[model samples]
Target chain A: PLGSRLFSRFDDGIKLDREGWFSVTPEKIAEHIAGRVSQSFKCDVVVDAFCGVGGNTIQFALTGMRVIAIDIDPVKIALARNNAEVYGIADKIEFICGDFLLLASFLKADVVFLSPPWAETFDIRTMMSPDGFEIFRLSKKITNNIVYFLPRNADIDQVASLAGPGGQVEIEQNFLNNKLKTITAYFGDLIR
Target chain B: PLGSRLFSRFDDGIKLDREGWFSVTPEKIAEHIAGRVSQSFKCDVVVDAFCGVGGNTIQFALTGMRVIAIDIDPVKIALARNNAEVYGIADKIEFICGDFLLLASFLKADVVFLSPPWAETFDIRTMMSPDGFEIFRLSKKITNNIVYFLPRNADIDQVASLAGPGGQVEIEQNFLNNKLKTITAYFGDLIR
Candidate 1:
């Protein structure tokens, strides 16, 4: 029942490591985000920058968008590839095994989706990679059109500033079963 | 009934402005911190660096230590003076109405207690004054023997680094009614 909450296809041979169990956006939420990104912007190429197990990538591919999914962990990429296949959309996604920061400049996309690890703290600026590198700052450099998923209690002012001095950000609080789940911050082209 | 949860002497004519009611440490926790600081170290003079309504300062005074309490807000100082009087330890504490950072160097104290504001976020470094000033960094400059009260979920590694390169820190979690309330980080002489 718990696994079912994370992925609707949990019974259908979906693969996820331990971190993937908690880190993946619930299937329904991922579908909603995918629909928004696909319809709201001129998004043809989408990059799931930190796709843990392809929860969002599967949904993104379902929207008929070109999804280039990347994760630093090869094991996660393997699992993600399997999960995308479980959703019958594996052929539509290109799964890459590498760091998004190192590969961000090389890969270009209309939308960059970031759901970076929350680490042990929610300090937006200090949210770390496994090696304690700040992820947001570098991720922001890749593109202006960002779909950033953060905890519901994230700093509003700091999140807004991600739009830069005169830029704009649209924050949407996602709720499931009457419980507030996560906040999604849409930046630049995705702001509408 | 709700106010009593914040202060043990809620019915005893305690003077708290709207902010003071939530900001002040509960009487029991304040008493526990006071006893620990007095018994653990060679502390005789104590400074309640951000003493709002004298919650900790009144308790510090009861420990037979020379207590000097400082607050940037003059109105809170007035309330703190009144609450100290109600606790029957008014003469034991000398209350000052100025910023601790501006006055830290001039005042010599064996221990400095900091319970700075948590702001809108729990990011320790960005914990603000009413005007968005970083309180912990400046408060640490006043003394190595610091008793910093922070939220229970504060970053442990970041809190430890406050003790500097080779220095040690002791963190204690304060709980009330089976719910974790706050974490107290002890630096320098207060580490034991």
Candidate 2:
């Protein structure tokens, strides 16, 4: 049974196995990311900038949109491919292994799903690299519609300022739990 | 030792004997109830109407004021007496065994603490016996200050309205959590 297998304990020493991953329940993450994708303009192609294990990529594929899942890590790309295969949507997604910033130039997507790391303890300068800023700076070059999840206290004004005056921004604070809030920002007239 | 006792298991049916009843932590209860009591009234002689085991009575006594602890049940009165004796503040409290309604007339209290049987469901009409409404009707006749710990979602507004325009009523919701708003209605300068 799924319940019994899920409950069974495995050895702690096993590395890069099922226990190695810090997994958020797929249903919740899909629900949030799917809502953002659906809110975006009807798109033929949707790109996941930080496609960790293809959670959001699979969701985009399920929405009848071709997905380009990009990540710098090969391990994560491998996992994403595996997840896409398990979900039977492997053919719908093109898993790309490269710096998402460099990869963004070659692909033209109608909607861009960006999930950036927002932990304060991590190196903020590297996380929000020049390329990351460029992604927001030249958002119009790649796609007019952008759906991204940011940290709770992120300054939407600062990001919107990067998008420039012509770029429209709509930000919504989504309460994940009693303690956590996931702020989603939609650029251009993509979100209604 | 306290930690061990807290974590230790015991028989569920165990009852506190008269001597063992001294284990009832009065100081903690007093400290917890003091905040609630002080917030209700400025300075008043507190009466524990249904003084179960006299926890609030001891608390009121700790505030350096005289307290009247009344209970209809003799076992409770004896238990309260024993507790008072153990606490060495027996002289400070006047423990009486009688009908609380009748006892209210003899005592002139500034604040009447009514912790009624809230667990049992009862209608407001049935709440007041044929003459019980007279007791609450003449609440102003006995004491102007009343502190009632009602059940969750209790119709406190109706109760305050019954107090009428001559008196002031304050309804504080979610005393512990502070999530719920505290309702305060003042008719006259009867209560601060």
Candidate 3:
């Protein structure tokens, strides 16, 4: 009922705000990132390590990629499944309600998509979701390739530094009416 | 850092997902809604009764209209303030933290913009935030001219029911990537 309408971004989405880290990847940015991953990485399956309400998870599924979407929140997972079903692609995703790192261990995938919350402090421990360092350490057990969606400038170095080699960070911004809107940090090809 | 991304909408936006009603007007739609509000209605000040982060409020200010933006969440208000400052027009807006209905009493404005929360249920009491009847009742005290931002297909007749004589509703569809996004139900010139 507290329609905090202005600054918060929403058009059509599975609802949430359990914490600050529950930020969703921009739809365009998610599509862009997912399109690149499907084309460049040539992966058939993706494990969304921090899939919040299936922003990237839906993109991956929309592109016909098999996805294991994981999030700690059951409500978000249910809504993500609802959204996926509305689009007739629930079969494409395996939704798991549990810790991403621990649950991720049982799955195999071509890429590990990590779009963490855009935390202001950039602190791994304090941030609502797992930070880059924690995600990298835990996600690598399942796959070597990772795609991260973060705040445009938050923790780029920290995320990139963990990439042993051949890691790249893409700074993507969305603009409307020639005004800069939201910024996303894309970390691609994080090497284990 | 909980980024809730999917459906809803996002190009460049403030981060949020506190609840289902926490919808942001798409930038294109916000500009369109704000554009029409200033030109067609010609108002000196806008009272955003359900201003959630300030999507429409920001656009109203960007178009050189003084705005009194109200919302229930202090966090969103703080974020909305930061967004306003970043846009170089903090001076153009007055951000308020409280219930819009209660606060609308003390203010004076030429126009009233109502983008109430999209409550899923049809019942006035069950819906998130205030429903059409509630918003209209309070907003009428501020101005005869009112603008509403609602879900793409939600509450068409309900909002129109409250518009009385000499009022009209314009249903506009927002699209991105050729996909039909949100539907904004615009109720204008409510005659009490």
Candidate 4:
């Protein structure tokens, strides 16, 4: 909670100076989404659940996709909207202030970008929550491909099992930092 | 001079318990040297200079060649002799206690092992000193092969220049550590 407040204030400073925030470093998040967009050239509508400060949402919009950014914290959602405006893609973003699990019904997109906080004990409940076994169950509800960013060192086997049978998942480890790994899993045979 | 004192302390600790001193985690050092020793199996003798602790010396003795171990410090020479005894190759190792440059006259080995300290300063005036170019220049006197374990990160062009003209030299750069490299220069006819 302390980190969220500190990050929110930091985001506010970046929002005030749009050039400073938009000109910030292009991290692995941008690169990861860019790769997916290139692979699936037809991704027109992108939804970013758990969008923090709109890092991935801006990247998705850069790929010419309309974005719906969702976050539980209003402060974070405001920062995301401000960042979208600075990047000249504010018209393309629909900012929603709600929880991803409870608010999933209101969101629909051709590509869903999920980047959850890696804090411990966040996924204790909802063996059916996306953070839990629910990731696979809810992923099947999406109309298009699902792009999720899991913890760097999360067990790939555990995540793969959650994808369940008939769900195709590919794991990519250590894409950016040599010490950390990134896993991207895709479901739905129709999208692949 | 400062390094000399530090190295003396390190050598003293090794003298107390050499098995612990040379007990580095098993890595590719053995495999790399085994391949090179097999390549130089036909050589009549192998000389190990700066044979601190004699780990590589023992490896070379495995090739069944008359191995000569040389070190400036008498304590290390004693350790090498003891190590050779423990390995049952004491009779094979001709321990020489003196500067390698001056002791070059007593050694006529076909293969010379030269693992010099990597951080020695480059001074042209001391090039003729017993420990200077003396060790490198003496290689010209050898009629057969020379396996010189050059300093890590030493410039290949500079080492090749040391070989002088009319003699051929083959050099291989081995990555021993992330920050260090082992350059082995084989001098003599370019063939066998």
Candidate 5:
């Protein structure tokens, strides 16, 4: 109920900046991905590379994984921390106010969850800053297991190519009320 | 616009009974399937096994393929014939008033398009009178190539199993206005 609605309910005591309201992942999808990460990896730590308002971060924490939630904006990180507190899992997450790409060298996690900002474009190459393809490439450096949240119509051929010659890519199309909500692609160790 | 809207435009001269109003496939989807059928096979004939008000039948006829459209209801068949005429392709299609299962032996075509009535259930087996699986099995007797239109949330695992151990199935999810409209499954030669 917390991350499901458009406007984060004021009564939940979770704080969100305006941008956070627009970008937070839905609770159902977050929970499902968190469960997958928890089951797929034996390591204790997971990283949410774009943890806006802790939508996914809170769900990851709930899965009993030590979550490193990073965001470029200090305001969003502050709000994400408050959101984690409201969900009563703030102690489980390590909140950092830094760009994930800039901090990728120093961070270590068994799994990296990328819910980067989706730019306006149908072309996957241009859909994000370190676009969908680039994020996968960069995340591969950090860990073999990466879960990417992308637009429903994002280029799957590009995603398939990321799996390389003999590797596999598992694309899960998440739907709500019979409409496609998000496309989650699991690379490397999370293929199952 | 003819088959796209909720209420079939009365001015289009396409007569529909109340049931036809709810069951007719949208024109966009019908046209796309028609094009697929047109390109997939060399035989000049294609059959619309459950032609409700000629939504798909009209599109098939327009593809320059000889079409035999069958329906159990005489009234619906009459309406379909009239709708085909409105689309200016009545002569291209032969409308028959008989249940497809009963008439399967007498019918022959290069491809069979089954947009049978989808019942209220998630299980593809129980989703129709003949059900999605039965339709595929029976249609295979008429031709190796078959295209089935199913509910968006219909059991895809059951759909995939129809391909057998080493066979292939191509499931196309058609969307309009960014919302899932229908799920079309291609079996046999239509896989491409």
Candidate 6:
């Protein structure tokens, strides 16, 4: 279920990687994000703080919102750029290959969508990355208009701290064939 | 159906790639190949002539047969090695990253499993890699004992040419959720 459900929505334009860098965001989920952003949120510019293979970044760009997509790996960044071009929205994204925290300071974002690598399962407090907590801490510096994708098993309290005091985190569990696949975590304006 | 079926089988150890190199054989199909090879084939050695990400290679080795897994890409070969290690069977394989046709002459295969990249759909005549027919023609030279994997839409005659003049190819369609998944083409000793 995990294998099939995770990839059921991707098109060939995006390079789907299993190299453990990060899971490719499924087409359904990306569309869900796009729909929410277009219908619910108010953002002239979007920042895909972790654009792994441009799964979410492509969707954000399709919304006609100028996007700043960043990743640490140049290889994935290049591929992500190519995928954007294939989607015919390459001109809409400013692809940056570096640490998000450093590059984020120079950029302005109406909303930030953060997707970190959550291998095995999602742990709000811990992750496979040794410095998993550090990633969340840095992403928080971006903006309160943020949307985060994590494993559906994540409880609301565990991820609510990702936003400030007034901000509330709303969680939705996506299911396929009665199995909970993944959770879409909304922060700030994304909270629905 | 193809999207989920192809990837659900792989673990985190082997990097399942979607850079248009090759498709990951589903876990159910790979397990079917292993079960058949272990039960039906007679060999102290097995050859995964076109190992790709080693989904089939790992299983062939798990049968305790000495396996010579070959691929044209060094990147996939490295990841396949890592995957083998994760499965605790690195000692069982000789990972070779080079043209399989160039190396197939030197290796002995009681049965050779060939999994070519089948995107869009499976075709007997044309493939993503242009010289697909030429590749299969040469693969027959390695061992009359060959086990070929193809898309489920494949019928017997489409892959019969891979077997010897007198040897006949037996095909089985593997279905998941009432959808045809993959075809296991049996040849030589693998013929049942």
Best by lDDT: 5
* Cα error, candidate 2, residue A125 (Å): 6.7
TM-score of each: 0.42, 0.41, 0.43, 0.39, 0.43, 0.44
> What is the C-alpha lDDT profile of model 3 across A35-61, one tens digit per residue?
767875557898987676776788889
Compute the lDDT of residue B27 as modeled in candidate 2: 40
lDDT of 4: 0.57
Q: Judged by lDDT relative to the true structure, which candidate is superior, 2 or 3?
A: 3
Query: Model 1 Cα displacement at A180 (Å)?
Result: 66
At residue A86, what lDDT does model 6 achieve? 90
Candidate rank order under lDDT:
5, 1, 6, 3, 2, 4
> Order of candidates by TM-score, top first?
6, 5, 3, 1, 2, 4
Which prediction has more favorable lDDT, 5 or 6? 5
Residue clash pairs of candidate 6: A4-B4
lDDT of 3 at A161: 61
Instruction: In candidate 5, list every pair of residues with a backbone clash.
Output: none
Pick out the ten consecutive residues of candidate 3 chain B with the lowest summed lDDT.
Answer: B1-10
Categorize the docking of model 4: incorrect
| TM-score: the better of candidates 5 and 6 | 6
Model 6 TM: 0.44
Model 4 steric clash pairs: A126-A129, A128-A134, A174-A181
Docking class of 1: incorrect
| Candidate number of the best TM-score | 6
Which of the two candidates, 1 or 5, achieves a greater TM-score against the reference?
5
Model 2 over residues B49-143: C-alpha lDDT tens digits?
Answer: 77878877877777666788887776677778778878788888887777777777777876776655433443343563323334454444557
lDDT of 6 by residue, B22-67 (tens): 2344665676677777776466667787788888888877877778
- Predicted candidate 2 versus true structure: per-residue lDDT over A1-192, tens digit per residue: 011101111111211212222234545555555655665556678888888888888888887789889889999999999988998889999999988777777788888887865554322235665445666644456887877666656655565554465555666555533444456666655555
Q: Which stretches of candidate 5 lie over 4 Å from their true place?
A: A1-192, B1-23, B119-121
Where is model 4 more than 4 Å wrong at Cα?
Answer: A1-26, A119-130, A189-192, B1-192
